[PDB]
Amino acid sequence: MGSSHHHHHHSSGLVPRGSATLGSGNLRQAVMLPEGEDLNEWIAVNTVDFFNQINMLYGTITEFCTESTCSVMSAGPRYEYHWADGTNIKKPIKCSAPKYIDYLMTWVQDQLDDETLFPSKIGVPFPKNFMSVAKTILKRLFRVYAHIYHQHFDAVMQLQEEAHLNTSFKHFIFFVQEFNLIDRRELAPLQELIEKLGSKDR
């Protein structure tokens, strides 16, 4: 009615900071054969590296994957996901991300440690066997990678470093593109995520 006085000042928004930076240079050499090495070896060399780099960053964000939200996966005695063979492998069972991922990284991690598809001794045919086996491995590395994007994109940011996922994607594409070994529809689900993200250079 008369002379009243009222005021309130407040503005919160303190964002935390303190992330580390990895100085990975001379990555170009890692994209193309070293000086002059065999191709069959190159493929096997980059596989362990590629899968190791992708499998490594996923281990930090994989812990984020929670809830049944995983399109339901097959795992367990009664029903489980088997590799190599493809005779009826699609049934609903209790299986989370860290669970299905295990079988994904397991298979891959196995071959990298299974002296048979790698160069060591004479026996297995690289230009025939290593190709079929390697084709199943490469497809697995990317497939699992996308998991971080779709299944838990936010999880990437929640871990401070997010550009890492996108950065590694370049080497995953540039590498296959440089040698021209791309194929399958796996490439389809790529132009979309790139367009949505955009292009930030400056």
PDB file of N, CA, C and O in Angstrom, residues 27-106:
ATOM      1  N   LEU A  27      50.191 -40.181 -35.731  1.00  0.00           N
ATOM      2  CA  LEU A  27      49.205 -41.245 -35.883  1.00  0.00           C
ATOM      3  C   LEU A  27      49.100 -41.697 -37.338  1.00  0.00           C
ATOM      4  O   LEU A  27      48.630 -42.798 -37.621  1.00  0.00           O
ATOM      5  N   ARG A  28      49.541 -40.841 -38.257  1.00  0.00           N
ATOM      6  CA  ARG A  28      49.493 -41.159 -39.681  1.00  0.00           C
ATOM      7  C   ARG A  28      50.250 -42.450 -39.977  1.00  0.00           C
ATOM      8  O   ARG A  28      49.766 -43.306 -40.719  1.00  0.00           O
ATOM      9  N   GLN A  29      51.435 -42.585 -39.393  1.00  0.00           N
ATOM     10  CA  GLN A  29      52.256 -43.774 -39.593  1.00  0.00           C
ATOM     11  C   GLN A  29      51.511 -45.027 -39.148  1.00  0.00           C
ATOM     12  O   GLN A  29      51.697 -46.107 -39.710  1.00  0.00           O
ATOM     13  N   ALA A  30      50.662 -44.873 -38.136  1.00  0.00           N
ATOM     14  CA  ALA A  30      49.882 -45.988 -37.613  1.00  0.00           C
ATOM     15  C   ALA A  30      48.735 -46.353 -38.552  1.00  0.00           C
ATOM     16  O   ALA A  30      48.131 -47.419 -38.422  1.00  0.00           O
ATOM     17  N   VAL A  31      48.431 -45.462 -39.493  1.00  0.00           N
ATOM     18  CA  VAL A  31      47.349 -45.695 -40.444  1.00  0.00           C
ATOM     19  C   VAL A  31      47.843 -46.457 -41.667  1.00  0.00           C
ATOM     20  O   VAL A  31      47.096 -47.224 -42.275  1.00  0.00           O
ATOM     21  N   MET A  32      49.104 -46.246 -42.020  1.00  0.00           N
ATOM     22  CA  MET A  32      49.698 -46.918 -43.171  1.00  0.00           C
ATOM     23  C   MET A  32      50.888 -47.776 -42.749  1.00  0.00           C
ATOM     24  O   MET A  32      51.603 -47.438 -41.804  1.00  0.00           O
ATOM     25  N   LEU A  33      51.091 -48.890 -43.460  1.00  0.00           N
ATOM     26  CA  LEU A  33      52.194 -49.817 -43.179  1.00  0.00           C
ATOM     27  C   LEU A  33      53.438 -49.083 -42.676  1.00  0.00           C
ATOM     28  O   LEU A  33      53.700 -47.947 -43.070  1.00  0.00           O
ATOM     29  N   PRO A  34      54.223 -49.725 -41.792  1.00  0.00           N
ATOM     30  CA  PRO A  34      55.435 -49.134 -41.234  1.00  0.00           C
ATOM     31  C   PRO A  34      56.659 -49.384 -42.109  1.00  0.00           C
ATOM     32  O   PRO A  34      57.224 -50.476 -42.102  1.00  0.00           O
ATOM     33  N   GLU A  35      57.062 -48.364 -42.861  1.00  0.00           N
ATOM     34  CA  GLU A  35      58.220 -48.471 -43.742  1.00  0.00           C
ATOM     35  C   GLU A  35      57.950 -49.450 -44.882  1.00  0.00           C
ATOM     36  O   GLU A  35      57.761 -49.046 -46.029  1.00  0.00           O
ATOM     37  N   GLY A  36      57.934 -50.740 -44.557  1.00  0.00           N
ATOM     38  CA  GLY A  36      57.687 -51.754 -45.564  1.00  0.00           C
ATOM     39  C   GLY A  36      57.413 -53.118 -44.959  1.00  0.00           C
ATOM     40  O   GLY A  36      58.272 -53.998 -44.979  1.00  0.00           O
ATOM     41  N   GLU A  37      56.212 -53.292 -44.417  1.00  0.00           N
ATOM     42  CA  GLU A  37      55.825 -54.556 -43.800  1.00  0.00           C
ATOM     43  C   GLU A  37      54.738 -55.249 -44.615  1.00  0.00           C
ATOM     44  O   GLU A  37      54.019 -54.608 -45.382  1.00  0.00           O
ATOM     45  N   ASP A  38      54.621 -56.561 -44.440  1.00  0.00           N
ATOM     46  CA  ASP A  38      53.620 -57.343 -45.158  1.00  0.00           C
ATOM     47  C   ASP A  38      52.212 -56.846 -44.842  1.00  0.00           C
ATOM     48  O   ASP A  38      51.956 -56.328 -43.755  1.00  0.00           O
ATOM     49  N   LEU A  39      51.305 -57.005 -45.798  1.00  0.00           N
ATOM     50  CA  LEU A  39      49.925 -56.572 -45.622  1.00  0.00           C
ATOM     51  C   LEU A  39      49.206 -57.439 -44.591  1.00  0.00           C
ATOM     52  O   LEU A  39      48.651 -56.927 -43.618  1.00  0.00           O
ATOM     53  N   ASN A  40      49.218 -58.750 -44.812  1.00  0.00           N
ATOM     54  CA  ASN A  40      48.566 -59.690 -43.902  1.00  0.00           C
ATOM     55  C   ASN A  40      48.924 -59.380 -42.453  1.00  0.00           C
ATOM     56  O   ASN A  40      48.105 -59.551 -41.550  1.00  0.00           O
ATOM     57  N   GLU A  41      50.146 -58.908 -42.243  1.00  0.00           N
ATOM     58  CA  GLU A  41      50.608 -58.555 -40.918  1.00  0.00           C
ATOM     59  C   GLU A  41      49.976 -57.234 -40.488  1.00  0.00           C
ATOM     60  O   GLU A  41      49.508 -57.095 -39.359  1.00  0.00           O
ATOM     61  N   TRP A  42      49.950 -56.275 -41.410  1.00  0.00           N
ATOM     62  CA  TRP A  42      49.366 -54.963 -41.148  1.00  0.00           C
ATOM     63  C   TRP A  42      47.952 -55.096 -40.613  1.00  0.00           C
ATOM     64  O   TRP A  42      47.596 -54.508 -39.593  1.00  0.00           O
ATOM     65  N   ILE A  43      47.152 -55.883 -41.317  1.00  0.00           N
ATOM     66  CA  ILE A  43      45.766 -56.118 -40.930  1.00  0.00           C
ATOM     67  C   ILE A  43      45.688 -56.625 -39.497  1.00  0.00           C
ATOM     68  O   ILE A  43      44.940 -56.096 -38.675  1.00  0.00           O
ATOM     69  N   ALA A  44      46.470 -57.657 -39.213  1.00  0.00           N
ATOM     70  CA  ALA A  44      46.503 -58.251 -37.881  1.00  0.00           C
ATOM     71  C   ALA A  44      47.060 -57.273 -36.846  1.00  0.00           C
ATOM     72  O   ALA A  44      46.633 -57.264 -35.691  1.00  0.00           O
ATOM     73  N   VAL A  45      48.020 -56.454 -37.267  1.00  0.00           N
ATOM     74  CA  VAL A  45      48.647 -55.474 -36.381  1.00  0.00           C
ATOM     75  C   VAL A  45      47.658 -54.404 -35.928  1.00  0.00           C
ATOM     76  O   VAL A  45      47.611 -54.046 -34.751  1.00  0.00           O
ATOM     77  N   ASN A  46      46.902 -53.875 -36.877  1.00  0.00           N
ATOM     78  CA  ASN A  46      45.945 -52.813 -36.598  1.00  0.00           C
ATOM     79  C   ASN A  46      44.695 -53.329 -35.894  1.00  0.00           C
ATOM     80  O   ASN A  46      44.028 -52.578 -35.183  1.00  0.00           O
ATOM     81  N   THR A  47      44.373 -54.601 -36.088  1.00  0.00           N
ATOM     82  CA  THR A  47      43.196 -55.184 -35.457  1.00  0.00           C
ATOM     83  C   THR A  47      43.301 -55.103 -33.939  1.00  0.00           C
ATOM     84  O   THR A  47      42.415 -54.571 -33.270  1.00  0.00           O
ATOM     85  N   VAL A  48      44.392 -55.631 -33.401  1.00  0.00           N
ATOM     86  CA  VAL A  48      44.619 -55.615 -31.963  1.00  0.00           C
ATOM     87  C   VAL A  48      44.674 -54.183 -31.447  1.00  0.00           C
ATOM     88  O   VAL A  48      44.193 -53.886 -30.355  1.00  0.00           O
ATOM     89  N   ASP A  49      45.263 -53.302 -32.246  1.00  0.00           N
ATOM     90  CA  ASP A  49      45.385 -51.896 -31.882  1.00  0.00           C
ATOM     91  C   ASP A  49      44.032 -51.213 -31.894  1.00  0.00           C
ATOM     92  O   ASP A  49      43.641 -50.544 -30.937  1.00  0.00           O
ATOM     93  N   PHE A  50      43.327 -51.392 -32.997  1.00  0.00           N
ATOM     94  CA  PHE A  50      42.006 -50.798 -33.169  1.00  0.00           C
ATOM     95  C   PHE A  50      41.052 -51.282 -32.085  1.00  0.00           C
ATOM     96  O   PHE A  50      40.451 -50.482 -31.367  1.00  0.00           O
ATOM     97  N   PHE A  51      40.920 -52.597 -31.974  1.00  0.00           N
ATOM     98  CA  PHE A  51      40.041 -53.196 -30.978  1.00  0.00           C
ATOM     99  C   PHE A  51      40.490 -52.836 -29.564  1.00  0.00           C
ATOM    100  O   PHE A  51      39.668 -52.723 -28.658  1.00  0.00           O
ATOM    101  N   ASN A  52      41.792 -52.656 -29.373  1.00  0.00           N
ATOM    102  CA  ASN A  52      42.317 -52.312 -28.058  1.00  0.00           C
ATOM    103  C   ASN A  52      41.965 -50.872 -27.695  1.00  0.00           C
ATOM    104  O   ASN A  52      41.643 -50.574 -26.545  1.00  0.00           O
ATOM    105  N   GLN A  53      42.028 -49.987 -28.681  1.00  0.00           N
ATOM    106  CA  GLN A  53      41.714 -48.580 -28.465  1.00  0.00           C
ATOM    107  C   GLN A  53      40.218 -48.387 -28.239  1.00  0.00           C
ATOM    108  O   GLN A  53      39.806 -47.595 -27.392  1.00  0.00           O
ATOM    109  N   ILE A  54      39.409 -49.119 -28.997  1.00  0.00           N
ATOM    110  CA  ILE A  54      37.962 -49.028 -28.874  1.00  0.00           C
ATOM    111  C   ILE A  54      37.471 -49.764 -27.637  1.00  0.00           C
ATOM    112  O   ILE A  54      36.575 -49.295 -26.935  1.00  0.00           O
ATOM    113  N   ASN A  55      38.073 -50.910 -27.373  1.00  0.00           N
ATOM    114  CA  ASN A  55      37.713 -51.717 -26.211  1.00  0.00           C
ATOM    115  C   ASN A  55      38.158 -51.038 -24.919  1.00  0.00           C
ATOM    116  O   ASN A  55      37.563 -51.242 -23.861  1.00  0.00           O
ATOM    117  N   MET A  56      39.217 -50.237 -25.011  1.00  0.00           N
ATOM    118  CA  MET A  56      39.751 -49.538 -23.847  1.00  0.00           C
ATOM    119  C   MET A  56      38.843 -48.388 -23.419  1.00  0.00           C
ATOM    120  O   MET A  56      38.532 -48.241 -22.236  1.00  0.00           O
ATOM    121  N   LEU A  57      38.428 -47.565 -24.377  1.00  0.00           N
ATOM    122  CA  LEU A  57      37.566 -46.427 -24.078  1.00  0.00           C
ATOM    123  C   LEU A  57      36.165 -46.877 -23.682  1.00  0.00           C
ATOM    124  O   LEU A  57      35.463 -46.173 -22.957  1.00  0.00           O
ATOM    125  N   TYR A  58      35.759 -48.052 -24.151  1.00  0.00           N
ATOM    126  CA  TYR A  58      34.439 -48.577 -23.828  1.00  0.00           C
ATOM    127  C   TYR A  58      34.392 -49.073 -22.387  1.00  0.00           C
ATOM    128  O   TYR A  58      33.343 -49.054 -21.748  1.00  0.00           O
ATOM    129  N   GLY A  59      35.536 -49.517 -21.881  1.00  0.00           N
ATOM    130  CA  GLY A  59      35.599 -50.011 -20.519  1.00  0.00           C
ATOM    131  C   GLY A  59      35.304 -48.932 -19.494  1.00  0.00           C
ATOM    132  O   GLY A  59      34.872 -49.227 -18.381  1.00  0.00           O
ATOM    133  N   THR A  60      35.549 -47.678 -19.867  1.00  0.00           N
ATOM    134  CA  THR A  60      35.317 -46.557 -18.969  1.00  0.00           C
ATOM    135  C   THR A  60      33.870 -46.070 -19.036  1.00  0.00           C
ATOM    136  O   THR A  60      33.346 -45.528 -18.062  1.00  0.00           O
ATOM    137  N   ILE A  61      33.232 -46.256 -20.187  1.00  0.00           N
ATOM    138  CA  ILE A  61      31.848 -45.821 -20.371  1.00  0.00           C
ATOM    139  C   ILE A  61      30.865 -46.988 -20.266  1.00  0.00           C
ATOM    140  O   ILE A  61      29.668 -46.781 -20.075  1.00  0.00           O
ATOM    141  N   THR A  62      31.373 -48.212 -20.392  1.00  0.00           N
ATOM    142  CA  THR A  62      30.526 -49.398 -20.310  1.00  0.00           C
ATOM    143  C   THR A  62      29.821 -49.474 -18.961  1.00  0.00           C
ATOM    144  O   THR A  62      28.667 -49.894 -18.873  1.00  0.00           O
ATOM    145  N   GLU A  63      30.523 -49.065 -17.909  1.00  0.00           N
ATOM    146  CA  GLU A  63      29.967 -49.087 -16.562  1.00  0.00           C
ATOM    147  C   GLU A  63      28.702 -48.236 -16.473  1.00  0.00           C
ATOM    148  O   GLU A  63      27.888 -48.413 -15.564  1.00  0.00           O
ATOM    149  N   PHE A  64      28.541 -47.311 -17.414  1.00  0.00           N
ATOM    150  CA  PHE A  64      27.376 -46.435 -17.431  1.00  0.00           C
ATOM    151  C   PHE A  64      26.132 -47.178 -17.910  1.00  0.00           C
ATOM    152  O   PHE A  64      25.027 -46.928 -17.430  1.00  0.00           O
ATOM    153  N   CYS A  65      26.315 -48.092 -18.862  1.00  0.00           N
ATOM    154  CA  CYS A  65      25.204 -48.864 -19.400  1.00  0.00           C
ATOM    155  C   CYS A  65      24.464 -49.594 -18.288  1.00  0.00           C
ATOM    156  O   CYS A  65      25.030 -50.442 -17.598  1.00  0.00           O
ATOM    157  N   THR A  66      23.195 -49.252 -18.120  1.00  0.00           N
ATOM    158  CA  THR A  66      22.368 -49.865 -17.090  1.00  0.00           C
ATOM    159  C   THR A  66      20.944 -50.086 -17.591  1.00  0.00           C
ATOM    160  O   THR A  66      20.607 -49.723 -18.718  1.00  0.00           O
ATOM    161  N   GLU A  67      20.112 -50.685 -16.742  1.00  0.00           N
ATOM    162  CA  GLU A  67      18.721 -50.962 -17.086  1.00  0.00           C
ATOM    163  C   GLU A  67      18.628 -52.031 -18.169  1.00  0.00           C
ATOM    164  O   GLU A  67      19.587 -52.273 -18.903  1.00  0.00           O
ATOM    165  N   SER A  68      17.468 -52.670 -18.260  1.00  0.00           N
ATOM    166  CA  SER A  68      17.241 -53.718 -19.251  1.00  0.00           C
ATOM    167  C   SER A  68      17.371 -53.176 -20.672  1.00  0.00           C
ATOM    168  O   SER A  68      17.531 -53.944 -21.621  1.00  0.00           O
ATOM    169  N   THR A  69      17.292 -51.855 -20.815  1.00  0.00           N
ATOM    170  CA  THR A  69      17.393 -51.211 -22.123  1.00  0.00           C
ATOM    171  C   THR A  69      18.612 -51.707 -22.899  1.00  0.00           C
ATOM    172  O   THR A  69      19.699 -51.140 -22.799  1.00  0.00           O
ATOM    173  N   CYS A  70      18.418 -52.768 -23.676  1.00  0.00           N
ATOM    174  CA  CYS A  70      19.499 -53.339 -24.474  1.00  0.00           C
ATOM    175  C   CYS A  70      18.952 -54.242 -25.577  1.00  0.00           C
ATOM    176  O   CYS A  70      19.654 -55.124 -26.073  1.00  0.00           O
ATOM    177  N   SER A  71      17.697 -54.018 -25.961  1.00  0.00           N
ATOM    178  CA  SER A  71      17.062 -54.811 -27.009  1.00  0.00           C
ATOM    179  C   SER A  71      17.023 -56.296 -26.648  1.00  0.00           C
ATOM    180  O   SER A  71      16.780 -57.141 -27.510  1.00  0.00           O
ATOM    181  N   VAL A  72      17.256 -56.612 -25.374  1.00  0.00           N
ATOM    182  CA  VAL A  72      17.242 -57.997 -24.912  1.00  0.00           C
ATOM    183  C   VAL A  72      18.280 -58.838 -25.652  1.00  0.00           C
ATOM    184  O   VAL A  72      18.306 -58.870 -26.883  1.00  0.00           O
ATOM    185  N   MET A  73      19.137 -59.517 -24.897  1.00  0.00           N
ATOM    186  CA  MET A  73      20.179 -60.353 -25.487  1.00  0.00           C
ATOM    187  C   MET A  73      20.104 -61.781 -24.954  1.00  0.00           C
ATOM    188  O   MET A  73      19.563 -62.026 -23.876  1.00  0.00           O
ATOM    189  N   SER A  74      20.651 -62.720 -25.721  1.00  0.00           N
ATOM    190  CA  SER A  74      20.646 -64.126 -25.330  1.00  0.00           C
ATOM    191  C   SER A  74      21.915 -64.481 -24.557  1.00  0.00           C
ATOM    192  O   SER A  74      23.028 -64.247 -25.030  1.00  0.00           O
ATOM    193  N   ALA A  75      21.737 -65.048 -23.368  1.00  0.00           N
ATOM    194  CA  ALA A  75      22.865 -65.435 -22.528  1.00  0.00           C
ATOM    195  C   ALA A  75      22.419 -66.370 -21.410  1.00  0.00           C
ATOM    196  O   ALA A  75      21.385 -66.151 -20.779  1.00  0.00           O
ATOM    197  N   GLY A  76      23.205 -67.415 -21.167  1.00  0.00           N
ATOM    198  CA  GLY A  76      22.872 -68.367 -20.123  1.00  0.00           C
ATOM    199  C   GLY A  76      22.835 -69.799 -20.631  1.00  0.00           C
ATOM    200  O   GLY A  76      22.861 -70.030 -21.840  1.00  0.00           O
ATOM    201  N   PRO A  77      22.774 -70.789 -19.722  1.00  0.00           N
ATOM    202  CA  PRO A  77      22.736 -72.208 -20.097  1.00  0.00           C
ATOM    203  C   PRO A  77      21.570 -72.533 -21.026  1.00  0.00           C
ATOM    204  O   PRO A  77      21.767 -73.040 -22.130  1.00  0.00           O
ATOM    205  N   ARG A  78      20.355 -72.240 -20.570  1.00  0.00           N
ATOM    206  CA  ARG A  78      19.155 -72.505 -21.360  1.00  0.00           C
ATOM    207  C   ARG A  78      19.265 -71.888 -22.752  1.00  0.00           C
ATOM    208  O   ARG A  78      18.923 -72.522 -23.750  1.00  0.00           O
ATOM    209  N   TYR A  79      19.745 -70.650 -22.809  1.00  0.00           N
ATOM    210  CA  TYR A  79      19.900 -69.950 -24.078  1.00  0.00           C
ATOM    211  C   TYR A  79      21.039 -68.937 -23.998  1.00  0.00           C
ATOM    212  O   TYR A  79      21.112 -68.144 -23.059  1.00  0.00           O
ATOM    213  N   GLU A  80      21.928 -68.973 -24.984  1.00  0.00           N
ATOM    214  CA  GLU A  80      23.065 -68.060 -25.018  1.00  0.00           C
ATOM    215  C   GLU A  80      23.446 -67.704 -26.450  1.00  0.00           C
ATOM    216  O   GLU A  80      22.989 -68.334 -27.403  1.00  0.00           O
ATOM    217  N   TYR A  81      24.288 -66.688 -26.588  1.00  0.00           N
ATOM    218  CA  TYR A  81      24.741 -66.238 -27.900  1.00  0.00           C
ATOM    219  C   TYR A  81      26.020 -66.963 -28.306  1.00  0.00           C
ATOM    220  O   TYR A  81      27.050 -66.843 -27.641  1.00  0.00           O
ATOM    221  N   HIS A  82      25.949 -67.717 -29.399  1.00  0.00           N
ATOM    222  CA  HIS A  82      27.104 -68.460 -29.889  1.00  0.00           C
ATOM    223  C   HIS A  82      27.690 -67.800 -31.133  1.00  0.00           C
ATOM    224  O   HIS A  82      26.959 -67.279 -31.974  1.00  0.00           O
ATOM    225  N   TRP A  83      29.015 -67.827 -31.239  1.00  0.00           N
ATOM    226  CA  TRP A  83      29.703 -67.229 -32.378  1.00  0.00           C
ATOM    227  C   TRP A  83      30.063 -68.294 -33.411  1.00  0.00           C
ATOM    228  O   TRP A  83      29.763 -69.474 -33.228  1.00  0.00           O
ATOM    229  N   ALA A  84      30.705 -67.869 -34.494  1.00  0.00           N
ATOM    230  CA  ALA A  84      31.104 -68.785 -35.559  1.00  0.00           C
ATOM    231  C   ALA A  84      29.888 -69.306 -36.318  1.00  0.00           C
ATOM    232  O   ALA A  84      29.709 -69.011 -37.499  1.00  0.00           O
ATOM    233  N   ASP A  85      29.055 -70.081 -35.632  1.00  0.00           N
ATOM    234  CA  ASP A  85      27.854 -70.642 -36.241  1.00  0.00           C
ATOM    235  C   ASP A  85      26.695 -69.653 -36.165  1.00  0.00           C
ATOM    236  O   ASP A  85      26.684 -68.757 -35.322  1.00  0.00           O
ATOM    237  N   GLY A  86      25.723 -69.820 -37.056  1.00  0.00           N
ATOM    238  CA  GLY A  86      24.573 -68.936 -37.073  1.00  0.00           C
ATOM    239  C   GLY A  86      23.268 -69.682 -37.259  1.00  0.00           C
ATOM    240  O   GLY A  86      22.474 -69.348 -38.139  1.00  0.00           O
ATOM    241  N   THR A  87      23.044 -70.696 -36.431  1.00  0.00           N
ATOM    242  CA  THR A  87      21.825 -71.493 -36.509  1.00  0.00           C
ATOM    243  C   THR A  87      20.854 -71.114 -35.396  1.00  0.00           C
ATOM    244  O   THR A  87      20.930 -71.639 -34.284  1.00  0.00           O
ATOM    245  N   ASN A  88      19.937 -70.202 -35.702  1.00  0.00           N
ATOM    246  CA  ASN A  88      18.947 -69.752 -34.729  1.00  0.00           C
ATOM    247  C   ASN A  88      19.619 -69.109 -33.520  1.00  0.00           C
ATOM    248  O   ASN A  88      19.787 -69.747 -32.479  1.00  0.00           O
ATOM    249  N   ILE A  89      20.000 -67.844 -33.664  1.00  0.00           N
ATOM    250  CA  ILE A  89      20.653 -67.114 -32.582  1.00  0.00           C
ATOM    251  C   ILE A  89      19.931 -65.796 -32.301  1.00  0.00           C
ATOM    252  O   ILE A  89      20.502 -64.717 -32.458  1.00  0.00           O
ATOM    253  N   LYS A  90      18.672 -65.895 -31.887  1.00  0.00           N
ATOM    254  CA  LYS A  90      17.872 -64.712 -31.585  1.00  0.00           C
ATOM    255  C   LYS A  90      16.733 -65.052 -30.629  1.00  0.00           C
ATOM    256  O   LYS A  90      15.628 -65.384 -31.057  1.00  0.00           O
ATOM    257  N   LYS A  91      17.010 -64.960 -29.332  1.00  0.00           N
ATOM    258  CA  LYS A  91      16.011 -65.252 -28.311  1.00  0.00           C
ATOM    259  C   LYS A  91      16.185 -64.330 -27.107  1.00  0.00           C
ATOM    260  O   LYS A  91      17.307 -63.962 -26.759  1.00  0.00           O
ATOM    261  N   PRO A  92      15.077 -63.936 -26.456  1.00  0.00           N
ATOM    262  CA  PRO A  92      15.127 -63.047 -25.292  1.00  0.00           C
ATOM    263  C   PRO A  92      15.604 -63.762 -24.033  1.00  0.00           C
ATOM    264  O   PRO A  92      15.074 -64.807 -23.660  1.00  0.00           O
ATOM    265  N   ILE A  93      16.609 -63.183 -23.381  1.00  0.00           N
ATOM    266  CA  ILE A  93      17.172 -63.742 -22.162  1.00  0.00           C
ATOM    267  C   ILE A  93      17.785 -62.633 -21.312  1.00  0.00           C
ATOM    268  O   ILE A  93      18.061 -61.542 -21.810  1.00  0.00           O
ATOM    269  N   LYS A  94      18.008 -62.914 -20.031  1.00  0.00           N
ATOM    270  CA  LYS A  94      18.599 -61.929 -19.135  1.00  0.00           C
ATOM    271  C   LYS A  94      20.043 -61.645 -19.540  1.00  0.00           C
ATOM    272  O   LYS A  94      20.929 -62.477 -19.344  1.00  0.00           O
ATOM    273  N   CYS A  95      20.272 -60.464 -20.108  1.00  0.00           N
ATOM    274  CA  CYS A  95      21.606 -60.071 -20.546  1.00  0.00           C
ATOM    275  C   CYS A  95      21.710 -58.556 -20.677  1.00  0.00           C
ATOM    276  O   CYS A  95      21.009 -57.942 -21.483  1.00  0.00           O
ATOM    277  N   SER A  96      22.592 -57.959 -19.884  1.00  0.00           N
ATOM    278  CA  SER A  96      22.792 -56.519 -19.915  1.00  0.00           C
ATOM    279  C   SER A  96      23.946 -56.163 -20.844  1.00  0.00           C
ATOM    280  O   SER A  96      24.479 -57.023 -21.546  1.00  0.00           O
ATOM    281  N   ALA A  97      24.329 -54.894 -20.842  1.00  0.00           N
ATOM    282  CA  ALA A  97      25.423 -54.429 -21.685  1.00  0.00           C
ATOM    283  C   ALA A  97      26.738 -55.098 -21.291  1.00  0.00           C
ATOM    284  O   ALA A  97      27.331 -55.825 -22.088  1.00  0.00           O
ATOM    285  N   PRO A  98      27.211 -54.867 -20.054  1.00  0.00           N
ATOM    286  CA  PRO A  98      28.460 -55.458 -19.565  1.00  0.00           C
ATOM    287  C   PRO A  98      28.499 -56.970 -19.764  1.00  0.00           C
ATOM    288  O   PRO A  98      29.573 -57.567 -19.846  1.00  0.00           O
ATOM    289  N   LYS A  99      27.322 -57.586 -19.846  1.00  0.00           N
ATOM    290  CA  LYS A  99      27.228 -59.028 -20.041  1.00  0.00           C
ATOM    291  C   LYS A  99      27.455 -59.388 -21.505  1.00  0.00           C
ATOM    292  O   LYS A  99      28.345 -60.176 -21.828  1.00  0.00           O
ATOM    293  N   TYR A 100      26.653 -58.804 -22.390  1.00  0.00           N
ATOM    294  CA  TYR A 100      26.786 -59.068 -23.816  1.00  0.00           C
ATOM    295  C   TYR A 100      28.142 -58.589 -24.325  1.00  0.00           C
ATOM    296  O   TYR A 100      28.752 -59.221 -25.187  1.00  0.00           O
ATOM    297  N   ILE A 101      28.612 -57.474 -23.774  1.00  0.00           N
ATOM    298  CA  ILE A 101      29.901 -56.914 -24.163  1.00  0.00           C
ATOM    299  C   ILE A 101      31.022 -57.912 -23.883  1.00  0.00           C
ATOM    300  O   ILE A 101      31.965 -58.039 -24.663  1.00  0.00           O
ATOM    301  N   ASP A 102      30.904 -58.620 -22.763  1.00  0.00           N
ATOM    302  CA  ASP A 102      31.901 -59.610 -22.376  1.00  0.00           C
ATOM    303  C   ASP A 102      32.109 -60.622 -23.493  1.00  0.00           C
ATOM    304  O   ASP A 102      33.239 -60.903 -23.892  1.00  0.00           O
ATOM    305  N   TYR A 103      31.007 -61.162 -23.999  1.00  0.00           N
ATOM    306  CA  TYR A 103      31.062 -62.138 -25.081  1.00  0.00           C
ATOM    307  C   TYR A 103      31.627 -61.501 -26.347  1.00  0.00           C
ATOM    308  O   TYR A 103      32.286 -62.164 -27.148  1.00  0.00           O
ATOM    309  N   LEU A 104      31.362 -60.209 -26.518  1.00  0.00           N
ATOM    310  CA  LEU A 104      31.844 -59.477 -27.683  1.00  0.00           C
ATOM    311  C   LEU A 104      33.353 -59.266 -27.603  1.00  0.00           C
ATOM    312  O   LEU A 104      34.083 -59.564 -28.546  1.00  0.00           O
ATOM    313  N   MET A 105      33.811 -58.749 -26.466  1.00  0.00           N
ATOM    314  CA  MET A 105      35.233 -58.501 -26.262  1.00  0.00           C
ATOM    315  C   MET A 105      35.986 -59.809 -26.044  1.00  0.00           C
ATOM    316  O   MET A 105      37.164 -59.922 -26.379  1.00  0.00           O
ATOM    317  N   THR A 106      35.292 -60.795 -25.485  1.00  0.00           N
ATOM    318  CA  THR A 106      35.885 -62.101 -25.224  1.00  0.00           C
ATOM    319  C   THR A 106      36.349 -62.751 -26.522  1.00  0.00           C
ATOM    320  O   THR A 106      37.521 -63.095 -26.678  1.00  0.00           O
TER     321      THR A 106
END
